[PDB]
Write a protein that binds this ligand. Structure first.
Ligand SMILES: N[C@@H](CCC(=O)O)C(=O)O
Ligand code: NA
Ligand code: NA
Length: 238
């Protein structure tokens, strides 16, 4: 059986969540996609889903993927963004889900988008465990003093409501999929400006894994048939 790392998510469980009363039993969009894709392969793939994370906060997804390079995981299934530092250590599938960063802010915010958020003095929120932190630092040179990690949609909402004046944020940078789920439950907030990154979600396997190439064909089969959108819509639908 393959040891498949799964992120032990504390928020936005629609993507992946551990089943109550179990360590190794998971449900969600990412798990349905995987299950769908494996069923199109010419060979059996017996798995053990191993939770990665402390159960209190969403894990570092980069660190989850690194456990492939150490041989602790045979691969990783979840909402894993196919970003460059990750692609240098493991082999991702074709993307099964479109993603990328947006700016989330209050209705009347003076922020026009990422460029305006940039030159500001104020805190920016990001999601616990996300690449979004290194992107803000490496790509936009935002001071670490300004970057606030936020673990839950409830923490997102409190931080935006409070604002910089009360130990909150002026805005949150997070990938569109989580943000759509957030705004669905928190209709006071908006995306400001354009999606300014475009990395999708992939399944991660060891470099030169045949399973990453076989699963890519299977994912292209799900997308071409409309099933990928069907799976997306059954888990994700102001
Ligand atoms: N999809 C995010 C992880 C989200 C989270 O922080 O839980 C990533 O690939 O980095
Ligand atoms: Na499921
Ligand atoms: Na094989």
């Amino acid at each position: 059986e393959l040891k498949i790392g799964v992120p032990l998510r504390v928020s936005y469980k629609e993507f992946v969540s551990q089943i109550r009363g179990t360590e190794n039993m998971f449900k969600g969009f990412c798990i349905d996609v995987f299950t769908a894709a494996v069923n199109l392969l010419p060979y059996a793939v017996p798995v053990k889903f191993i939770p990665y994370g402390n159960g209190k906060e969403n894990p570092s997804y980069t660190h989850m993927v690194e456990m492939i390079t150490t041989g602790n995981f045979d691969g990783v299934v979840g909402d894993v963004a196919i970003v460059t530092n990750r692609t240098k250590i493991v082999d991702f599938t074709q993307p099964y889900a479109a993603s990328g960063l947006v700016v989330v802010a209050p209705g009347g915010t003076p922020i026009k988008g990422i460029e305006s958020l940039r030159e500001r003095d104020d805190p920016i929120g990001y999601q616990v465990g996300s690449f979004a932190e290194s992107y803000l630092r490496n790509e936009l040179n935002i001071s670490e003093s300004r970057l606030v990690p936020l673990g839950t949609p409830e923490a997102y909402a409190k931080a935006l409501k409070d604002g910089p004046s009360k130990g909150g944020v002026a805005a949150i940078v997070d990938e569109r999929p989580y943000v759509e789920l957030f705004l669905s439950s928190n209709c006071a907030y908006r995306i400001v400006g354009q999606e300014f990154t475009k990395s999708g979600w992939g399944f991660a396997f060891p470099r030169d894994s045949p399973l990453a190439i076989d699963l890519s064909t299977a994912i292209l089969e799900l997308a071409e048939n409309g099933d990928l959108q069907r799976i997306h819509d059954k888990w994700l639908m102001c």
